[model samples]
Target: NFCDITITPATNRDVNVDRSANIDLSFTIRQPQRCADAGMRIKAWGEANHGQLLIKPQGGNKSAGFTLASPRFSYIPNNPANIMNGFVLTNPGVYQLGMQGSITPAIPLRPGLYEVVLNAELVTNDNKQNATAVAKTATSTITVV
Candidate 1:
């Protein structure tokens, strides 16, 4: 069975750019039980080109899609098997993650209400599970105005 995970905006949801430019996040995880033999190791898919964080506007002016780094699991998720970055399918848990902006055109975070889309996809680093599972994408709003 697939592990159930939930992600939400922790610090960047309704804050303005003047208040802060960093987008923080949080996650709640509770997945299927793990056992021997067919047990699997899960981890965040951060294997380059496959960016997990995507930011865009909810409406208005129609903003361009901005792909950002994942708040956590900079490496592929793996534990004992070592899939570069993966989990050992351990007991469910919660985690806090975040991201920050500082440069780019000397200005970042324009004045507009935007949607912070998290393309959260956990991968079972084994050849059996593959990386084709349908991971959920969570959306949280951020304000720059």
Candidate 2:
């Protein structure tokens, strides 16, 4: 009935210095129904204040701009447990979107406070226009060096 999204090391303070971090995203589905089997991939990209940094979901909402990459997977038995693993970042700036597996080759991030948003829909065959709602959209932010 619930899902939790959090970054490792607690805070985003180390993002700039480390250039990379290991993130574990997990969710728990409601009773009676098990979590659906789906591929969930994620992309990390950003934007800058003065300089123009191309971001995912730029001109449109976060859901629209996601690049095409490997969709993640949630295994069996857990039924209600849904999760995705391992996302990395290297660029610096205010990014447009923190994608859930659109395109790969993690986007570069800028320093300062950046936003990390989470969007979850029933995994669909078509990422662009066919996403169905299994859950609502969730968003958060982190800062890099």
Give per-model TM-scores.
0.47, 0.30
Whole-model lDDT per candidate: 0.39, 0.29
lDDT per residue for candidate 2 within 64-143, as digits (tens), equals 33232333323222222212222221111211122223222364434344443343333322342333334333333344
Clashes of each: 8, 28
Q: Residue 11 deviation, candidate 2, in Å?
A: 9.5
Total residue pair clashes for candidate 2:
28
List runs of model 2 lying over 4 Å from the truth.
1-72, 77-110, 122-135
Estimate the overall C-alpha local distance difference test score of candidate 1. 0.39
Point to the candidate with the largest TM-score. 1
Ten residues in a row with the worst lDDT in model 1? Answer: 88-97
Give lDDT for model 2. Answer: 0.29
Candidate RMSDs in Å, in order, are 6.7, 12.5
